Homo-oligomer: A and B are copies of this chain.
Amino acid sequence: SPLAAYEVDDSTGYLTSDVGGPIQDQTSLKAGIRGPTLLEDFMFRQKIQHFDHERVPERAVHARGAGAHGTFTSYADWSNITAASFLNATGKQTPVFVRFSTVAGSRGSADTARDVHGFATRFYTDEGNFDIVGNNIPVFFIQDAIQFPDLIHSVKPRPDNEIPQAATAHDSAWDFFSQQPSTMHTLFWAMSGHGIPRSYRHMDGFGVHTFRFVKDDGSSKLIKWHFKSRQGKASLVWEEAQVLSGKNADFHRQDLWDAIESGNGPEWDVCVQIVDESQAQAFGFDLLDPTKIIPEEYAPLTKLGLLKLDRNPTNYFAETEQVMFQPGHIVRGIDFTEDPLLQGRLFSYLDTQLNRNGGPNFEQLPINMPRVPIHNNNRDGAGQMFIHRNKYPYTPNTLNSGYPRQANQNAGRGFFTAPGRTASGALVREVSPTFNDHWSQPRLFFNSLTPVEQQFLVNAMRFAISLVKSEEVKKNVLTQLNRVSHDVAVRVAAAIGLGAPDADDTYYHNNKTAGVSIVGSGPLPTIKTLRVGILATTSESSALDQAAQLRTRLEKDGLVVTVVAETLREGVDQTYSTADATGFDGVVVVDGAAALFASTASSPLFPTGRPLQIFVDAYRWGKPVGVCGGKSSEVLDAADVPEDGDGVYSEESVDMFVEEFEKGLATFRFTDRFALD
């Protein structure tokens, strides 16, 4: 409804051309009933021309994504730290649109690739659109925007054959990573569970760069943006993510869409670290360096307000595909820093919309329009929608009484550059030596994961680097990993038949920081929307009765229940043929269905062994699993699952089963099922 003024209703009426002439569109005009098609058929040509021209260029990066409408609510009057109008009163509401994405894949690539993820937020503020174009990882691969095409060429498919679409699993990517050691920190994040988040709702957003908050009095503070998920942090496991990339390439957009439709619209606390201008070089690194975090121990998070996504788009193309974010969409109360990565982005996002939109009036697209008046002397250009009344669009003028008026620090609530900002020195294409430690923070991150988490990251690196054909690249990779951790280099090297180089302890240390572990972030604060697959059978009325009883008690607590059986009927959502363990956060077998789990079981209605495969996959990927009804050992023995296993449930009582199982869904993953080196 925030874009209701642009909506077109086709629930009634006769087909028209784009100029409102009623027409047909089902049969071409022909010279006789078996004749050739006539050039004078305007109905044909106008419809096919539109179809022919439907597609626009995909985004150069973050081509794969999904968006939703929502509201931002301020917790306070933040005048004391920023002039930003959207933050100036307790409870002040501002409409938002968010797009989540992967980075490397083209617009049809699977959601559950291993990748960095985007988290872009537009605030339609009463002083203009403000965009925070962030990622789910707080540090970037590179220290200077000029290097972005080198990064993205190296991670994107090899340009002779456009193979492979596995961003982190080919020679060219590891060549870049190993020759550009700045990459180590973001690389360690991408090789962790942060590279395969369970959903958009179960990851954070980060501005990455230091920005400024600027008060009306002109004073400034340095800030980092942190959008902290109220759903909690969760990952897939790789073995799961690969299958899910085939069974459901749309998994993350469907999870978000379903959460909003079910009234479970995801929430983030929008937070900042605030530090003084004097602390730019005080934390043992440069706040202008986007490869570095400020440990929460040095600067705590201040909660500014609530971000809630609660409305799906009406038309995906018009809203999600066409949304054009820019870090240059800035408001009074915010300013840039001399982060050489941020500095260059400001150019890129204004320029790239010419490519996507095919013309300069992209801010006039409904999704890009602000919610306040526009007063400027911008004119003409392809696709001009506005009819400007002012016939003297120049400053300075008298013929339009000197309107529009210049807005600045002192008049018209103008944007203004933080007036304490200076530059001094040579005009240089030189890197600050303050940027030169590429390895300490990667080690900080690694140090801050749990032992099983550390194993998962080593395993992601073993997987990816084992696919690199070049022996010289694999050696260069072990040289860089070794500068972060000798142990990581030895464990990765073991997988690929190379020796790790000798320990180089220059950057080694045992410092740790809170808030970067997924496994370590404890049970989820809510299980609403989590997916329970109930494996039943049509062959036993009592199996369906057990399933209906389990459904009622699970749905009461807001879980999404799928009853699976051989065929569809009342109370069965999916067939075994379409069901998979990647479809569920937990799997329950009703003991009336135990016959389906025998090695002997066979049906033309589903692939050999499908019922037991769903159970075994779910167990092996660490999910809560169990048998409800009391007769558990036929199913558990066929699955090779121990009855006494953590996150393995066997109860006769539906009530006791669900109370135990719901604890399992909160735990989310049972990490004792994964081997350690």
- Is the Cβ of A387 less than 8 Å from the Cβ of B51? no
* Nearest-CB residue, chain B, relative to A316: B162
Q: How large is the interface on A (under 10, 10 to 19, 20 to 34, 35 or more residues)?
A: 35 or more
- Is the Cβ of A350 less than 8 Å from the Cβ of B249? no
- Is the Cβ of A19 less than 8 Å from the Cβ of B329? yes
A521 contacts B by Cβ under 8 Å: no
For the complex, what is the distance from the CA of A19 to the CA of B256, rounded to whole Å?
27
- Is the Cβ of B25 less than 8 Å from the Cβ of A254? no
* Nearest-CB residue, chain B, relative to A381: B53
* Nearest-CB residue, chain B, relative to A61: B51
**Which residue of B36, B318, B384 contacts A387 across the interface (Cβ within 8 Å)?**
B318
- Interface residue SS majority, chain A: loop
Nearest Cβ in chain B — how far from A218, in angstroms?
A: 11
Contact with B along A380-419 (1 / 0, CB 8 A): 1111111111111111111111011111100111110100
Residues from chain B with Cβ under 8 Å of A392 in the complex:
153-154, 172, 175
Residues from chain B with Cβ under 8 Å of A257 in the complex:
161, 163
- Is the Cβ of B374 less than 8 Å from the Cβ of A18? yes
Nearest Cβ in chain B — how far from A55, in angstroms?
A: 4
- Is the Cβ of A23 less than 8 Å from the Cβ of B415? yes
- Is the Cβ of A107 less than 8 Å from the Cβ of B106? yes
Assuming A28-B344, A39-B343, is B46 touching A55 (CB within 8 A)? no
- Is the Cβ of B383 less than 8 Å from the Cβ of A15? no
**Which residue of B6, B25, B158 contacts A377 across the interface (Cβ within 8 Å)?**
B25
**Which residue of B28, B50, B328, B426 contacts A149 across the interface (Cβ within 8 Å)?**
B50
A278 contacts B by Cβ under 8 Å: no
**Which residue of B22, B64, B382 contacts A56 across the interface (Cβ within 8 Å)?**
B382
**Which residue of B32, B47, B151, B253 contacts A162 across the interface (Cβ within 8 Å)?**
B253
For the complex, what is the distance from the CA of A74 to the CA of B145, rounded to whole Å?
39
- Is the Cβ of B160 less than 8 Å from the Cβ of A20? no
* Nearest-CB residue, chain B, relative to A369: B19
A58 contacts B by Cβ under 8 Å: yes
Residues from chain B with Cβ under 8 Å of A90 in the complex:
none
- Is the Cβ of B159 less than 8 Å from the Cβ of A398? no
Taking CB atoms and an 8 Å cut-off, the chain A residues in 257-293 that contact chain B are: 257, 286, 288
Residues from chain B with Cβ under 8 Å of A322 in the complex:
384
* Nearest-CB residue, chain B, relative to A68: B161
- Is the Cβ of A158 less than 8 Å from the Cβ of B391? yes
Nearest Cβ in chain B — how far from A400, in angstroms?
A: 7
Copies of this polypeptide in the complex = 3
Contact with B along A99-133 (1 / 0, CB 8 A): 00000011111101000000000000001110000
Q: Which of A9, A153, A180, A424 has the most CB of B within 10 A?
A: A153
Contact with B along A37-72 (1 / 0, CB 8 A): 111111111111111111111111001101000000
* Nearest-CB residue, chain B, relative to A55: B57
- Is the Cβ of A411 less than 8 Å from the Cβ of B37? no
Binds B, one of A356-364, A619-627, A654-662: A356-364
A607 contacts B by Cβ under 8 Å: yes
* Nearest-CB residue, chain B, relative to A280: B34
Nearest Cβ in chain B — how far from A129, in angstroms?
A: 4
Binds B, one of A294-302, A427-435, A492-500: A427-435
For the complex, what is the distance from the CA of A248 to the CA of B57, rounded to whole Å?
25
Residues from chain B with Cβ under 8 Å of A380 in the complex:
54-56, 317-318, 321
A601 contacts B by Cβ under 8 Å: no
- Is the Cβ of A315 less than 8 Å from the Cβ of B160? yes
A330 contacts B by Cβ under 8 Å: yes
Residues from chain B with Cβ under 8 Å of A358 in the complex:
358-359, 382-383
Contact with B along A518-545 (1 / 0, CB 8 A): 0000000000000000000000000000
Binds B, one of A331-339, A504-512, A585-593: A331-339
- Is the Cβ of A48 less than 8 Å from the Cβ of B108? no
A450 contacts B by Cβ under 8 Å: no
Assuming A7-B387, A172-B394, A314-B389, is B55 touching A58 (CB within 8 A)? yes
For the complex, what is the distance from the CA of A161 to the CA of B314, rounded to whole Å?
8
Residues from chain B with Cβ under 8 Å of A245 in the complex:
110, 245-247, 249
**Which residue of B128, B150, B379, B426 contacts A19 across the interface (Cβ within 8 Å)?**
B128
Residues from chain B with Cβ under 8 Å of A470 in the complex:
none
* Nearest-CB residue, chain B, relative to A341: B28
- Is the Cβ of A30 less than 8 Å from the Cβ of B338? yes
- Is the Cβ of B23 less than 8 Å from the Cβ of A31? no
Q: Return 27 A-B CB contacts under 8 Å, by A number.
A: A15-B375, A16-B375, A18-B370, A18-B378, A21-B370, A22-B332, A24-B406, A25-B395, A26-B395, A28-B39, A28-B144, A34-B338, A36-B40, A39-B39, A39-B41, A45-B350, A47-B377, A49-B350, A54-B381, A110-B245, A157-B250, A159-B315, A159-B379, A171-B399, A315-B387, A322-B384, A358-B358
The 4 A-B residue pairs with the shortest CB-CB distance in the complex, in nearest-first order: A106-B108, A246-B246, A21-B128, A14-B412
Given known contacts A14-B406, A56-B57, A56-B381, what 14 new A-B pairs fall within 8 Å (CB)?
Answer: A21-B127, A22-B127, A23-B376, A25-B376, A38-B38, A43-B146, A46-B350, A48-B149, A52-B354, A54-B379, A56-B380, A110-B246, A154-B397, A366-B387
